[PDB]
Design an enzyme around this catalytic site. Sequence first.
Site, mmCIF file in Angstrom:
data_model
loop_
_atom_site.group_PDB
_atom_site.id
_atom_site.type_symbol
_atom_site.label_atom_id
_atom_site.label_comp_id
_atom_site.label_asym_id
_atom_site.label_seq_id
_atom_site.Cartn_x
_atom_site.Cartn_y
_atom_site.Cartn_z
ATOM 1 N N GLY A 70 0.766 -1.370 0.047
ATOM 2 C CA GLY A 70 -0.096 -0.003 0.221
ATOM 3 C C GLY A 70 0.774 1.339 0.032
ATOM 4 N N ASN A 71 2.122 1.121 0.131
ATOM 5 C CA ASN A 71 3.052 2.416 0.478
ATOM 6 C C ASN A 71 3.246 3.167 -1.074
ATOM 7 O OD1 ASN A 71 3.302 3.473 2.940
ATOM 8 N ND2 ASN A 71 4.544 1.663 3.413
ATOM 9 N N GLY A 72 3.692 2.325 -2.103
ATOM 10 C CA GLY A 72 3.858 2.872 -3.326
ATOM 11 C C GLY A 72 2.297 3.665 -3.756
ATOM 12 N N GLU A 73 1.357 2.864 -3.524
ATOM 13 C CA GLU A 73 0.005 3.055 -3.731
ATOM 14 C C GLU A 73 -0.407 4.547 -3.085
ATOM 15 O OE1 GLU A 73 1.161 0.137 -2.669
ATOM 16 O OE2 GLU A 73 0.983 -0.823 -4.718
ATOM 17 N N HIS A 100 -8.902 12.930 11.922
ATOM 18 C CA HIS A 100 -7.704 13.785 11.771
ATOM 19 C C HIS A 100 -7.445 14.528 10.703
ATOM 20 C CE1 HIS A 100 -5.819 13.112 16.060
ATOM 21 N NE2 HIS A 100 -7.201 12.938 15.953
ATOM 22 N N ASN A 101 -7.164 13.677 9.459
ATOM 23 C CA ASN A 101 -6.412 14.028 8.301
ATOM 24 C C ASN A 101 -7.522 14.297 7.161
ATOM 25 O OD1 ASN A 101 -4.168 11.418 8.834
ATOM 26 N ND2 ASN A 101 -4.058 13.358 9.372
ATOM 27 N N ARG A 111 -0.810 -7.856 1.239
ATOM 28 C CA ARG A 111 -0.023 -8.799 1.841
ATOM 29 C C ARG A 111 0.400 -8.861 3.361
ATOM 30 N NH1 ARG A 111 4.266 -7.750 -3.471
ATOM 31 N NH2 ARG A 111 3.408 -9.372 -4.803
HETATM 32 O O1 LIG Z 1 -1.503 13.072 11.142
HETATM 33 C C1 LIG Z 1 -1.436 13.701 12.159
HETATM 34 C C2 LIG Z 1 -0.749 13.390 13.314
HETATM 35 O O2 LIG Z 1 -1.458 12.159 13.817
HETATM 36 C C3 LIG Z 1 -0.750 14.469 14.236
HETATM 37 O O3 LIG Z 1 0.549 14.307 15.125
HETATM 38 C C4 LIG Z 1 -1.949 14.591 15.098
HETATM 39 O O4 LIG Z 1 -2.903 15.036 14.311
HETATM 40 C C5 LIG Z 1 -1.895 15.303 16.421
HETATM 41 O O5 LIG Z 1 -2.964 15.225 17.119
HETATM 42 P P1 LIG Z 1 -3.361 16.307 18.438
HETATM 43 O O6 LIG Z 1 -1.862 15.912 19.288
HETATM 44 O O7 LIG Z 1 -3.298 17.741 17.904
HETATM 45 O O8 LIG Z 1 -4.652 15.692 18.962
HETATM 46 O O1 LIG Z 2 4.178 -0.469 -3.103
HETATM 47 C C1 LIG Z 2 4.009 -1.107 -4.018
HETATM 48 C C2 LIG Z 2 3.165 -2.416 -3.834
HETATM 49 O O2 LIG Z 2 3.629 -2.920 -2.690
HETATM 50 C C3 LIG Z 2 3.209 -3.293 -5.120
HETATM 51 O O3 LIG Z 2 2.116 -4.021 -5.131
HETATM 52 C C4 LIG Z 2 4.510 -4.318 -5.228
HETATM 53 O O4 LIG Z 2 5.692 -3.495 -4.960
HETATM 54 C C5 LIG Z 2 4.329 -5.193 -6.251
HETATM 55 O O5 LIG Z 2 5.804 -5.686 -6.621
HETATM 56 P P1 LIG Z 2 5.661 -7.324 -7.502
HETATM 57 O O6 LIG Z 2 4.359 -7.898 -7.291
HETATM 58 O O7 LIG Z 2 5.725 -6.500 -8.830
HETATM 59 O O8 LIG Z 2 7.061 -7.984 -6.758
#
Ligand SMILES: O=C[C@H](O)[C@H](O)[C@H](O)COP(=O)(O)O
Ligand SMILES: O=C[C@H](O)[C@H](O)[C@H](O)COP(=O)(O)O
Lengths: 157, 157
Positions: A70-73, A100-101, A111
């Site tokens: 999910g990170n590249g995504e 929050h976001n 995986r």
């Molecule tokens: O994505 C934002 C991060 O989780 C912040 O540190 C968080 O929103 C801080 O929360 P708060 O301390 O202002 O309640």
């Molecule tokens: O952040 C990317 C995600 O984890 C992709 O699905 C992964 O890198 C795919 O890798 P591969 O199946 O081509 O080895």
Amino acid sequence: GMRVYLGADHAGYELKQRIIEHLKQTGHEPIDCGALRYDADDDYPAFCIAAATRTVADPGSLGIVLGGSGNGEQIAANKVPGARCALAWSVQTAALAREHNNAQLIGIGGRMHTVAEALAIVDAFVTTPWSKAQRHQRRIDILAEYERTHEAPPVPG
Amino acid sequence: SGMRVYLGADHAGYELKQRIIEHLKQTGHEPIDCGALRYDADDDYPAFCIAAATRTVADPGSLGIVLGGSGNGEQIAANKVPGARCALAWSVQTAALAREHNNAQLIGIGGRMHTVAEALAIVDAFVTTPWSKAQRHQRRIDILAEYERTHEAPPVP
Ligand SMILES: O=C[C@H](O)[C@H](O)[C@H](O)COP(=O)(O)O
Ligand SMILES: O=C[C@H](O)[C@H](O)[C@H](O)COP(=O)(O)O
């Protein structure tokens, strides 16, 4: 019920199909941005950019991008102007992403979780309200303004 | 082996950042603190995360770490910086994959989500795991980079 845009490469594909069915069963309108079949060699960015672009363009919708981790995504989603894509790896982080976001999207690593765990993550994501709290909005506004100008905001002190 | 590492954090990641800084020094790396420089319960994460990401991109071969409560708003902010790739690291495995697969120069870590020992293990994986240079990963990074260049969504297959 909500339109939810889903995108995934091969590594997130099977989980994406499960999530689509779960979202239908729970009263949502999933929209599949692709991949539309398993292709072991396919490349995540296009699907994630598509889901993020479509989500941002569609008021009140959410999106979900899946891959191995999910990170590249989420990185790819986050390149889309106006998109805020969290990486959700727990019910708590899915919920905070909304609270929050005001994240319109989450990434999920296919995986990294059992199907049950992933669906619990999805449930938290689609049911947790955006807080509308002052400080969270302020921070989102700061980011949006940086997106607009690329003028890095000054650090306090 | 020894890496330059730019760190940024709001109040929620502040204490953990200070611990990481000391850990990085102890393990032979070069931490650079972008702020926050003190605990301010009301402060706003984007400026610190954008600073860390911007300095990381401008200093090729460096890494960056952004911290807050969850790390998610923090990585979202980092990811708005041209050329930045910021994963959310919530485990040793995902810190490692961030380097291996995504060539991520930054990770976000949630200070409210881990014990210090768990956080430092994540940091160790991140600063020690090599970027793989594998063809398919470079291809995907290049696709994303081209989208960041033009903001023209690449067609899906
Ligand atoms: O994505 C934002 C991060 O989780 C912040 O540190 C968080 O929103 C801080 O929360 P708060 O301390 O202002 O309640
Ligand atoms: O952040 C990317 C995600 O984890 C992709 O699905 C992964 O890198 C795919 O890798 P591969 O199946 O081509 O080895």
